[PDB]
Amino acid sequence: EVVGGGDLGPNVLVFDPSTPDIQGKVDEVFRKQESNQFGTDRYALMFKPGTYNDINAQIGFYTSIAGLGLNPDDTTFNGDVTVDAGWFDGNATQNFWRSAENLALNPVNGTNRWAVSQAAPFRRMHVKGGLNLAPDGYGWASGGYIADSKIDGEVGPYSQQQWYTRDSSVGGWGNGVWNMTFSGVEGAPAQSFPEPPYTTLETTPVSREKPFLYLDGDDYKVFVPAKRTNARGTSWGNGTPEGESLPLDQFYVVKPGATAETINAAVDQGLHLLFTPGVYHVDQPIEIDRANTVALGLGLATIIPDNGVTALKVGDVDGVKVAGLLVDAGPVNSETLVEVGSDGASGDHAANPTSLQDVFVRIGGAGPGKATTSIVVNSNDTIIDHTWVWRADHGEGVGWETNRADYGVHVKGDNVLATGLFVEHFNKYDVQWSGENGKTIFYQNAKAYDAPDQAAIQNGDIKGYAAYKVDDSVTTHEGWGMGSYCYFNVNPDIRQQHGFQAPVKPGVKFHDLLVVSLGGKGQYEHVINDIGDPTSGDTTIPSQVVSFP
Ligand SMILES: OC[C@H]1O[C@@H](O[C@@H]2[C@@H](O)[C@H](O[C@@H]3[C@@H](O)[C@H](O[C@@H]4[C@@H](O)[C@H](O[C@@H]5[C@@H](O)[C@H](O[C@@H]6[C@@H](O)[C@H](O)O[C@H](CO)[C@H]6O)O[C@H](CO)[C@H]5O)O[C@H](CO)[C@H]4O)O[C@H](CO)[C@H]3O)O[C@H](CO)[C@H]2O)[C@H](O)[C@@H](O)[C@@H]1O
Ligand SMILES: OC[C@H]1O[C@@H](O[C@@H]2[C@@H](O)[C@H](O[C@@H]3[C@@H](O)[C@H](O[C@@H]4[C@@H](O)[C@H](O[C@@H]5[C@@H](O)[C@H](O)O[C@H](CO)[C@H]5O)O[C@H](CO)[C@H]4O)O[C@H](CO)[C@H]3O)O[C@H](CO)[C@H]2O)[C@H](O)[C@@H](O)[C@@H]1O
């Protein structure tokens, strides 16, 4: 059999307004995690409700930080939750795999710094001041994601290339660079793309905030927010939100040596899943096939599928909420790494969809890794709300053929919604969409940097594979605020025909598309299909299309 809750383990650090020496304890964790890009250390830093002084929590790799009130101001720092780029000389483009949630910050000089790139979510926060998203010195950065937050002051992206903000409120917005996209953001500036580069939607068509651990006195529980349709502003701002409150004791609590058979036992049983911060090798797919199951990872908990298996398969059921996991490919090629629904998923899940939130996939970088497709999205009405699906461009075990990964995300279900979609470096199509009435709000892609010649990436009569392809027999699709970048470093004479590919049809629509060549390392011929300017020069200027077709 099994057994509910238990021990969060030595990787979940639980503070309150004693705990002696706080700076020192978060100081240590940062020293060991700051440069630790591909290590297997994992940590979640959890703060009980209360007020905390003379704090500055610098957050390194694979560190999550959060509060345990039901609401963010229940846990207040007079002080900072800080990400900077010291370890990389003010270059913030490797500042990955960390997170902040459910805290109020009163930043020591008036502005908190969160200078991150991909897979660094900022959720359910209240900043009582400004928010600077740039490293000190204002060097390179490539984030980013804010949801369900209230920034009393101005957000300053400065050097940030791109950004997505959802269902939030901001006291100001400083600038854009290439693609700043907003949905359901109060204080968002009006649609203006290309100058400034702002894509702005009054509302988010559907959203459902990511589940989180909190304290009910001396009782741990997981708050699980309900669906909001046409979401705008925060879910918490005018007080206690809609949801359901599940005790720790109704979760199976995964520590790094459970098997996929026991994780499974536990699900078949009716227990939810809470992954404690660690790395979990499995020899079978984790299989979630009960409705309303919650599978929540702390401290960037990571699943590695061995033996070429799929890591995670969700059945054809309502309401599964997968949140806060990194899926890291093994050296043996996996056919798929994550599947949501079966091969031909026909029913609906309108009222109670399945979602992936802060689900990150890595192929290579910490050793060789391979997978044919990373995420397959079969079930109708699925919500993909912040994902980074990343074929490693640096680190260990990468190479055009060494960490080969042809396909990033393939969407086959209908009425699927992606908000905050980041997918990079696949050998073939990064994103393919075959289902009907899909919607993407915000896309960031960089193409494979390692392609060795033009022939390698030939797509029939087309040079390259689109970063985002909508199948030709698709009738209805819409995308907002989307960019694809190239940096063909191995062979800069390569040409990429386009960033985007779609049939021409009145029901297929795109808004605010762009492609960019980074320092002239290769060029795009067009933006989408054979439409839009090629990129030219070595000067980093996007080519843009505002409206299509
Ligand atoms: O590393 C692997 C990792 O790589 C990623 O891809 C890399 C990619 O991110 C990188 O792209 C470079 C790109 O970011 C860079 O963008 C610049 C942008 O930084 C610049 O910002 C300016 C600010 O500099 C400026 O600062 C102001 C300052 O001048 C003044 O002193 O003070 C002001 C305050 O008072 C301050 O504001 O502010 C302005 C706005 O006011 C910003 O615009 O802006 C320019 C364009 O305007 C923009 O181009 O450009 C580089 C080239 O020029 C790019 O190279 O490129 C790498 C390649 O070398 C990529 O590898 C991937 O995504 C990850 O998957 C990989 O793992
Ligand atoms: O006390 C509250 C504040 O705490 C901060 O956290 C500290 C943290 O930011 C700091 O990180 C250091 C990095 O900033 C540093 O990175 C270098 C840059 O500083 C530098 O920028 C300069 C720029 O300052 C100057 O004005 O102009 C120069 C050029 O025109 C520009 O270069 O650029 C460097 C690269 O060229 C870059 O390396 O590197 C240090 C060493 O690794 C980091 O230490 O570290 C502190 C250590 O404890 C943190 O406390 C918050 O960020 C603030 O928001 C808080 O208010």
XYZ file of C-alpha atoms and ligand atoms in Angstrom:
672
model
C 0.000 0.000 0.000
C 1.221 3.647 0.764
C 0.584 6.535 3.346
C -0.134 10.227 3.097
C 1.945 13.217 4.145
C 5.158 12.997 6.187
C 8.503 14.854 6.407
C 9.138 17.510 3.742
C 12.790 16.492 4.219
C 16.100 18.314 4.659
C 15.806 20.136 1.261
C 12.749 22.239 2.390
C 13.993 24.900 4.777
C 11.255 26.362 6.967
C 11.929 29.762 8.547
C 10.021 31.979 10.899
C 10.819 35.350 12.493
C 13.314 33.821 14.715
C 15.293 31.158 13.181
C 18.605 32.528 14.206
C 20.887 33.941 11.554
C 18.647 34.216 8.482
C 20.986 36.116 6.165
C 23.662 33.529 6.920
C 21.367 30.567 6.134
C 20.122 32.001 2.838
C 23.669 33.394 2.210
C 25.052 29.797 2.423
C 22.481 28.326 0.004
C 23.258 31.088 -2.511
C 27.022 30.421 -2.277
C 26.522 26.800 -3.143
C 23.810 27.516 -5.752
C 24.958 30.759 -7.385
C 27.117 29.189 -10.132
C 25.587 25.739 -9.879
C 23.961 25.706 -13.272
C 23.793 21.973 -13.918
C 24.238 20.456 -10.443
C 21.651 18.263 -8.791
C 21.367 20.248 -5.510
C 17.741 21.457 -5.016
C 16.238 23.787 -2.379
C 12.946 25.386 -1.388
C 13.042 28.236 1.090
C 9.761 28.609 2.909
C 8.801 31.479 5.179
C 6.037 31.250 7.791
C 3.690 34.242 8.012
C 5.158 37.261 9.730
C 7.498 40.208 9.246
C 11.177 39.703 8.418
C 13.867 42.454 8.755
C 17.440 43.072 7.432
C 16.860 40.485 4.806
C 18.237 40.168 1.281
C 17.560 36.665 -0.065
C 19.757 36.229 -3.140
C 18.331 33.356 -5.160
C 20.668 31.037 -7.109
C 20.007 28.073 -9.379
C 17.365 25.527 -8.362
C 16.156 27.584 -5.411
C 12.495 28.448 -4.839
C 11.453 31.004 -2.200
C 7.991 31.583 -0.913
C 5.628 32.535 1.803
C 3.096 30.357 3.662
C 0.210 32.755 4.271
C -2.967 32.250 2.217
C -2.213 35.791 1.011
C 1.071 37.453 -0.041
C 1.079 40.261 2.594
C 0.740 37.728 5.396
C 4.525 37.160 4.789
C 6.441 40.439 4.470
C 10.165 41.069 3.909
C 11.558 44.467 4.838
C 14.180 43.571 2.369
C 14.761 41.905 -0.966
C 14.345 38.703 -2.975
C 17.234 39.299 -5.351
C 18.562 37.851 -8.620
C 21.606 39.523 -10.161
C 24.352 38.253 -12.528
C 27.615 38.695 -10.571
C 28.699 35.163 -11.402
C 28.468 35.884 -15.139
C 29.748 39.483 -15.353
C 26.401 41.231 -15.512
C 25.194 38.884 -18.262
C 21.845 37.519 -16.978
C 21.144 35.106 -19.873
C 21.929 31.958 -17.909
C 19.885 32.958 -14.849
C 17.502 30.022 -15.021
C 15.426 27.574 -12.905
C 14.436 29.511 -9.809
C 11.267 31.124 -8.458
C 9.517 33.486 -6.029
C 5.901 33.185 -4.862
C 3.419 34.457 -2.229
C 5.496 37.139 -0.520
C 5.293 40.867 0.068
C 8.553 42.826 -0.430
C 9.469 46.230 0.980
C 12.742 46.602 -0.915
C 15.577 48.185 0.981
C 16.185 51.002 -1.550
C 12.687 51.115 -2.990
C 13.227 48.703 -5.890
C 13.615 44.941 -5.903
C 15.911 43.328 -8.503
C 14.701 40.160 -10.274
C 17.165 39.948 -13.186
C 16.299 36.557 -14.634
C 16.000 34.789 -17.937
C 13.935 31.673 -18.683
C 12.112 29.398 -16.164
C 12.228 31.926 -13.336
C 8.573 32.568 -12.410
C 7.473 35.518 -10.214
C 3.985 34.590 -8.945
C 1.573 35.963 -6.341
C 3.940 38.674 -5.202
C 3.341 42.105 -3.742
C 6.205 44.526 -4.337
C 5.772 47.661 -2.244
C 7.984 49.644 -4.610
C 9.542 49.219 -8.024
C 10.788 46.091 -9.763
C 13.983 46.153 -11.833
C 14.309 43.158 -14.183
C 17.843 44.051 -15.341
C 21.157 43.021 -13.890
C 23.215 45.793 -12.413
C 25.106 47.306 -15.366
C 22.092 46.561 -17.476
C 23.730 43.773 -19.511
C 22.008 41.068 -21.461
C 18.875 39.350 -20.211
C 16.125 37.117 -21.680
C 13.137 36.525 -19.399
C 10.515 36.393 -18.191
C 7.202 35.747 -16.465
C 5.077 37.565 -13.911
C 1.627 36.407 -12.878
C -0.981 37.332 -10.306
C 1.252 40.013 -8.822
C 0.934 43.645 -7.759
C 3.895 45.975 -8.209
C 3.070 49.203 -6.395
C 5.804 51.001 -8.357
C 7.250 50.860 -11.881
C 8.489 47.738 -13.592
C 11.831 48.505 -15.311
C 12.869 45.960 -17.902
C 15.740 48.051 -19.333
C 17.806 45.421 -21.216
C 15.288 42.524 -21.010
C 14.607 41.445 -24.570
C 11.091 40.219 -23.986
C 8.603 39.646 -21.126
C 5.161 38.276 -20.336
C 2.909 39.578 -17.601
C -0.439 38.006 -16.770
C -3.336 39.010 -14.522
C -1.484 41.509 -12.426
C -1.277 45.203 -11.664
C 1.683 47.508 -12.122
C 2.331 51.039 -10.918
C 4.341 51.764 -14.048
C 6.134 50.130 -17.001
C 9.528 51.447 -18.032
C 10.164 50.278 -21.604
C 10.169 47.540 -24.143
C 13.066 46.060 -26.184
C 11.667 43.464 -28.619
C 8.419 41.979 -27.222
C 6.705 42.998 -24.011
C 3.321 41.251 -23.885
C 0.556 41.794 -21.361
C -2.763 40.133 -20.656
C -5.167 41.142 -17.898
C -2.702 43.685 -16.565
C -3.955 46.834 -14.874
C -1.444 49.626 -15.423
C -0.353 47.958 -18.638
C 0.287 50.482 -21.316
C -1.902 50.392 -24.407
C -1.239 48.247 -27.453
C 1.376 50.095 -29.505
C 3.594 47.521 -31.297
C 6.104 48.060 -32.885
C 6.774 51.356 -31.008
C 7.107 50.758 -28.164
C 7.079 46.983 -28.593
C 3.911 46.402 -26.489
C 1.244 43.755 -27.148
C -1.667 44.299 -24.790
C -4.783 42.345 -24.155
C -7.339 43.684 -21.728
C -8.025 40.159 -20.440
C -6.701 36.616 -20.270
C -9.302 34.319 -21.844
C -8.896 31.647 -19.200
C -6.464 31.300 -16.259
C -6.172 29.336 -13.090
C -3.513 30.299 -10.575
C -0.802 27.746 -9.755
C -1.337 25.706 -6.588
C 0.832 26.422 -3.575
C 1.754 25.197 -0.119
C 0.588 27.298 2.837
C 0.119 27.028 6.598
C -3.177 26.720 8.353
C -1.803 27.465 11.813
C 0.357 24.478 12.391
C -1.316 22.581 9.522
C 0.315 22.403 6.075
C -2.108 22.512 3.131
C -2.111 23.217 -0.606
C -4.331 25.977 -1.915
C -5.754 25.141 -5.313
C -7.305 28.141 -7.186
C -10.374 27.890 -9.398
C -10.664 28.920 -13.094
C -11.161 32.627 -13.947
C -12.411 33.428 -17.417
C -11.532 36.876 -18.871
C -9.147 37.291 -16.032
C -7.731 40.723 -15.177
C -5.903 42.018 -12.146
C -4.851 39.836 -9.232
C -6.918 36.994 -7.745
C -6.100 37.930 -4.182
C -6.145 41.750 -4.149
C -9.745 42.287 -2.967
C -9.344 39.355 -0.579
C -9.592 35.582 0.012
C -9.973 33.898 -3.313
C -11.989 31.026 -4.579
C -10.396 27.621 -4.207
C -10.251 24.341 -2.289
C -7.790 23.527 0.555
C -6.075 20.160 0.586
C -4.133 18.936 3.658
C -0.595 17.667 3.390
C -2.126 14.388 4.586
C -3.977 13.934 1.305
C -0.658 14.257 -0.622
C 1.933 11.570 -1.205
C 5.243 13.155 -0.442
C 7.914 12.156 -2.836
C 11.398 11.859 -1.535
C 14.329 10.960 -3.862
C 14.114 7.238 -3.952
C 10.376 6.577 -4.419
C 9.689 4.573 -7.654
C 7.264 5.394 -10.414
C 5.334 2.229 -9.201
C 4.780 3.797 -5.676
C 4.091 7.339 -6.917
C 1.627 5.505 -9.010
C 0.166 3.299 -6.237
C -0.383 6.559 -4.432
C -2.222 8.156 -7.383
C -4.301 5.074 -8.177
C -5.229 5.336 -4.468
C -6.461 8.914 -4.553
C -3.448 10.747 -3.092
C -2.128 13.881 -4.705
C 1.616 14.301 -5.259
C 4.070 16.709 -3.648
C 7.610 16.402 -4.970
C 10.186 17.534 -2.415
C 13.270 19.224 -3.880
C 15.423 16.536 -5.421
C 16.135 14.618 -8.587
C 13.930 11.623 -9.362
C 15.026 8.961 -11.794
C 12.115 6.770 -12.938
C 12.036 3.523 -15.033
C 8.367 3.891 -15.826
C 6.163 6.919 -16.663
C 4.553 8.701 -13.762
C 0.907 8.114 -14.702
C -1.816 10.501 -13.541
C -5.292 9.203 -14.425
C -7.628 10.548 -11.732
C -9.484 13.782 -12.082
C -8.419 16.815 -10.036
C -5.051 15.309 -9.144
C -2.501 17.855 -8.126
C 1.179 17.161 -8.786
C 3.189 20.000 -7.320
C 6.991 20.223 -7.232
C 8.996 22.220 -4.684
C 12.530 23.576 -5.159
C 12.615 22.735 -8.917
C 12.026 19.048 -8.266
C 13.248 17.185 -11.314
C 12.137 13.974 -13.036
C 14.587 12.004 -15.194
C 13.170 9.160 -17.293
C 15.584 6.281 -17.705
C 15.535 3.531 -20.367
C 13.914 5.840 -22.954
C 10.602 5.968 -21.139
C 8.141 8.900 -21.069
C 8.470 10.802 -17.792
C 4.888 11.904 -17.233
C 1.567 10.864 -18.783
C -1.759 12.444 -17.838
C -4.923 10.559 -18.742
C -8.163 11.751 -20.343
C -9.554 13.306 -17.185
C -10.584 16.754 -15.931
C -8.673 19.036 -13.646
C -5.141 17.672 -13.350
C -2.774 20.421 -12.250
C 0.865 19.761 -12.793
C 3.042 22.522 -11.339
C 6.713 23.263 -10.695
C 8.575 20.352 -12.192
C 11.645 20.141 -14.388
C 11.710 17.151 -16.730
C 15.307 16.398 -17.760
C 15.922 13.944 -20.597
C 18.078 10.907 -20.071
C 20.936 9.817 -22.354
C 18.656 7.167 -23.904
C 16.262 8.748 -26.387
C 12.729 9.135 -25.148
C 9.987 9.179 -27.662
C 8.109 11.680 -25.623
C 8.929 13.266 -22.316
C 5.496 14.550 -21.343
C 2.088 13.543 -22.661
C -1.205 15.175 -21.781
C -4.029 12.873 -22.820
C -4.156 9.901 -25.142
C -3.380 9.341 -28.914
C -6.759 10.719 -30.180
C -8.333 12.517 -27.202
C -11.904 13.306 -28.124
C -13.847 14.577 -25.147
C -13.898 17.955 -23.541
C -12.650 19.548 -20.363
C -14.137 23.046 -20.606
C -15.392 23.511 -17.087
C -12.306 21.950 -15.442
C -9.253 21.701 -17.690
C -5.881 20.074 -17.115
C -2.926 22.492 -16.891
C 0.845 22.512 -16.940
C 2.303 25.403 -14.918
C 6.022 26.100 -14.448
C 6.745 22.889 -16.267
C 10.275 23.054 -17.652
C 11.885 20.501 -19.984
C 15.638 20.253 -20.561
C 17.351 18.111 -23.219
C 21.071 17.874 -22.474
C 23.378 20.328 -20.650
C 24.012 18.238 -17.518
C 25.188 15.335 -19.588
C 23.901 13.966 -22.854
C 20.140 13.773 -23.295
C 17.738 13.130 -26.204
C 14.057 12.995 -26.920
C 12.038 12.977 -30.123
C 9.202 15.235 -28.937
C 9.239 16.853 -25.513
C 5.599 17.679 -24.759
C 2.599 16.272 -26.562
C -0.679 17.992 -25.795
C -3.616 15.742 -26.721
C -6.464 16.730 -24.358
C -8.892 19.389 -25.335
C -9.021 22.647 -23.366
C -5.591 22.164 -21.787
C -3.908 25.284 -20.341
C -0.150 25.642 -20.717
C 0.720 28.559 -18.389
C 4.448 29.209 -18.352
C 6.609 26.529 -19.891
C 10.282 26.511 -21.009
C 11.050 23.620 -23.324
C 14.758 23.846 -23.988
C 17.177 21.764 -25.967
C 20.459 22.723 -24.290
C 22.708 25.094 -26.275
C 25.546 24.919 -23.776
C 26.797 22.751 -20.974
C 27.709 19.091 -21.092
C 26.348 16.558 -23.526
C 25.259 18.904 -26.299
C 25.894 18.596 -29.999
C 23.808 18.704 -33.196
C 23.651 14.915 -33.014
C 24.732 14.474 -29.273
C 21.615 16.075 -27.668
C 19.437 15.773 -30.743
C 15.795 16.696 -30.088
C 13.644 17.149 -33.173
C 10.399 18.509 -31.774
C 9.575 20.683 -28.767
C 5.842 20.960 -28.313
C 3.160 19.417 -30.448
C -0.407 20.528 -29.811
C -3.031 18.120 -31.092
C -6.016 18.948 -28.880
C -8.642 21.604 -29.528
C -9.235 24.849 -27.573
C -5.742 24.648 -26.023
C -4.333 27.863 -24.558
C -0.668 28.667 -24.086
C 0.175 31.753 -22.000
C 3.923 32.352 -21.601
C 5.345 29.880 -24.129
C 9.174 29.628 -24.337
C 10.622 26.899 -26.636
C 14.196 26.828 -27.975
C 16.822 25.157 -30.104
C 15.092 22.063 -31.495
C 16.554 20.351 -34.597
C 13.180 20.548 -36.377
C 9.900 22.318 -35.461
C 10.066 23.874 -31.985
C 6.288 24.160 -31.836
C 3.715 22.402 -34.065
C -0.038 22.993 -33.686
C -2.515 20.586 -35.289
C -5.574 21.037 -33.074
C -8.316 23.608 -33.661
C -8.938 27.065 -32.024
C -5.568 27.152 -30.357
C -4.483 30.431 -28.723
C -0.918 31.511 -27.821
C -0.313 34.638 -25.778
C 3.429 35.341 -25.796
C 6.020 33.169 -27.561
C 9.781 33.265 -27.297
C 12.002 31.072 -29.416
C 15.657 30.850 -30.373
C 16.530 28.444 -33.164
C 19.195 25.731 -32.978
C 22.542 27.478 -32.645
C 24.513 24.328 -33.621
C 23.208 23.455 -37.128
C 26.299 22.634 -39.159
C 25.183 23.638 -42.698
C 22.090 24.550 -44.718
C 21.425 20.945 -45.757
C 21.123 19.790 -42.116
C 17.885 21.836 -41.672
C 16.301 21.404 -45.062
C 12.424 21.223 -44.823
C 11.508 20.177 -48.389
C 11.594 23.344 -50.609
C 12.004 25.332 -47.365
C 15.176 26.357 -45.627
C 14.783 25.601 -41.959
C 11.871 24.479 -39.847
C 9.616 27.144 -38.477
C 9.839 27.880 -34.799
C 6.016 27.806 -34.751
C 3.980 25.942 -37.307
C 0.205 25.777 -37.595
C -0.877 22.774 -39.693
C -2.266 23.576 -43.162
C -5.640 21.858 -42.521
C -6.261 24.044 -39.454
C -9.219 26.465 -39.624
C -9.046 28.548 -36.438
C -5.882 29.688 -34.543
C -4.668 32.924 -32.967
C -1.306 34.066 -31.604
C -0.155 37.321 -29.965
C 3.301 38.711 -29.233
C 5.652 36.193 -30.768
C 9.365 36.213 -31.547
C 11.950 33.826 -32.994
C 15.731 34.558 -32.847
C 18.697 32.977 -34.680
C 22.380 32.605 -33.756
C 23.852 30.148 -36.184
C 27.278 30.192 -34.545
C 28.607 27.016 -36.091
C 27.708 28.205 -39.586
C 26.773 31.919 -39.879
C 26.114 31.667 -43.632
C 22.931 29.663 -42.900
C 19.520 31.061 -43.836
C 16.266 30.394 -41.964
C 13.300 30.898 -44.290
C 10.938 32.080 -41.581
C 10.044 32.099 -37.908
C 6.390 31.146 -38.442
C 4.466 28.918 -40.904
C 0.635 28.704 -41.345
C -2.010 28.211 -43.937
C -3.644 31.306 -45.325
C -7.236 31.376 -43.951
C -9.423 34.005 -42.373
C -9.720 32.040 -39.094
C -5.904 31.836 -38.652
C -4.656 35.109 -37.141
C -1.371 36.416 -35.797
C -0.595 39.681 -34.081
C 2.820 41.250 -33.459
C 5.290 38.768 -34.951
C 9.027 39.268 -35.153
C 12.294 37.582 -36.075
C 15.778 38.648 -35.078
C 19.295 37.714 -36.069
C 21.699 37.969 -33.151
C 24.860 39.785 -34.351
C 24.506 38.613 -37.962
C 25.019 34.945 -37.139
C 22.787 33.712 -39.949
C 19.725 35.522 -41.203
C 15.969 35.078 -41.642
C 14.553 35.360 -45.211
C 11.132 36.373 -43.930
C 9.009 36.529 -40.788
C 6.115 34.156 -41.581
C 5.658 32.064 -44.698
C 7.371 34.370 -47.352
C 6.048 37.469 -45.834
C 7.951 40.173 -43.998
C 11.423 41.556 -44.514
C 14.500 39.462 -44.244
C 16.777 40.393 -41.376
C 19.971 42.148 -42.505
C 23.251 43.537 -41.154
C 24.920 42.399 -37.914
C 23.128 45.089 -35.920
C 20.325 43.135 -34.071
C 17.244 44.695 -35.701
C 14.016 42.753 -35.634
C 11.941 42.328 -38.762
C 8.285 42.554 -37.802
C 4.857 41.738 -39.077
C 1.965 43.482 -37.261
C -1.117 41.765 -38.771
C -1.688 38.402 -40.592
C -2.853 37.186 -43.096
O 23.823 32.062 -23.404
C 22.999 31.026 -23.820
C 21.554 31.417 -23.751
O 21.431 32.465 -24.755
C 20.095 32.923 -25.041
O 20.282 33.574 -26.257
C 21.306 34.651 -26.130
C 20.641 35.985 -26.346
O 19.880 36.388 -25.233
C 21.611 37.107 -26.641
O 20.970 38.250 -27.102
C 21.700 39.493 -27.006
C 20.665 40.506 -26.612
O 20.134 40.285 -25.315
C 21.136 41.949 -26.667
O 20.019 42.788 -26.542
C 20.309 44.242 -26.529
C 19.841 44.756 -25.226
O 20.612 44.209 -24.145
C 19.952 46.286 -25.179
O 19.479 46.758 -23.931
C 19.400 48.236 -23.875
C 20.134 48.574 -22.636
O 21.498 48.243 -22.767
C 20.022 50.022 -22.269
O 20.674 50.256 -21.091
C 20.654 51.708 -20.709
C 22.029 52.146 -20.621
O 22.475 52.339 -21.980
C 22.255 53.444 -19.858
O 23.513 53.516 -19.484
O 21.467 53.508 -18.629
C 20.084 53.348 -18.889
C 19.372 53.558 -17.599
O 19.359 54.876 -17.093
C 19.794 51.985 -19.511
O 18.435 51.898 -19.841
O 18.633 50.338 -22.140
C 17.973 50.170 -23.410
C 16.618 50.738 -23.283
O 16.533 52.059 -22.757
C 18.019 48.716 -23.882
O 17.457 48.637 -25.203
O 19.103 46.791 -26.241
C 19.544 46.326 -27.533
C 18.650 46.865 -28.584
O 18.117 48.116 -28.274
C 19.499 44.822 -27.593
O 19.916 44.442 -28.903
O 21.769 42.143 -27.977
C 22.883 41.292 -28.215
C 23.568 41.845 -29.474
O 23.556 43.243 -29.586
C 22.358 39.852 -28.310
O 23.424 39.001 -28.589
O 22.441 36.693 -27.751
C 23.233 35.564 -27.357
C 24.277 35.377 -28.454
O 25.572 35.887 -28.172
C 22.318 34.384 -27.177
O 23.017 33.188 -26.909
C 19.115 31.777 -25.247
O 17.785 32.272 -25.330
C 19.272 30.753 -24.176
O 18.490 29.552 -24.468
C 20.634 30.270 -24.114
O 20.795 29.194 -23.151
O 21.901 46.008 -0.466
C 20.726 45.955 -1.266
C 20.972 45.736 -2.726
O 21.546 44.425 -2.861
C 21.784 44.020 -4.232
O 22.269 42.706 -4.250
C 23.706 42.649 -4.401
C 24.021 42.252 -5.782
O 23.399 43.091 -6.780
C 25.513 42.224 -6.026
O 25.810 41.652 -7.240
C 27.087 42.111 -7.800
C 26.847 42.428 -9.228
O 25.967 43.533 -9.409
C 28.135 42.652 -9.977
O 27.925 42.687 -11.321
C 28.741 43.652 -12.005
C 28.037 44.971 -12.048
O 27.951 45.541 -10.749
C 28.605 46.011 -13.054
O 27.758 47.068 -13.196
C 28.451 48.354 -13.342
C 27.607 49.391 -12.783
O 27.346 49.193 -11.385
C 28.180 50.768 -13.010
O 27.306 51.692 -12.602
O 28.481 50.982 -14.429
C 29.326 49.989 -15.014
C 29.485 50.231 -16.472
O 28.984 51.426 -16.994
C 28.826 48.579 -14.768
O 29.786 47.658 -15.250
O 28.945 45.381 -14.348
C 29.820 44.223 -14.186
C 30.165 43.691 -15.499
O 30.696 44.603 -16.386
C 29.157 43.153 -13.331
O 30.032 42.065 -13.175
O 29.103 41.594 -9.713
C 29.409 41.344 -8.311
C 30.433 40.235 -8.177
O 30.070 38.964 -8.592
C 28.124 41.087 -7.536
O 28.445 41.016 -6.166
O 26.127 41.372 -5.004
C 25.836 41.750 -3.663
C 26.649 40.877 -2.787
O 26.160 40.553 -1.525
C 24.337 41.725 -3.414
O 24.103 42.119 -2.058
C 20.500 44.169 -5.033
O 20.786 43.804 -6.404
C 19.906 45.494 -4.928
O 18.687 45.582 -5.720
C 19.701 45.887 -3.509
O 19.183 47.218 -3.349
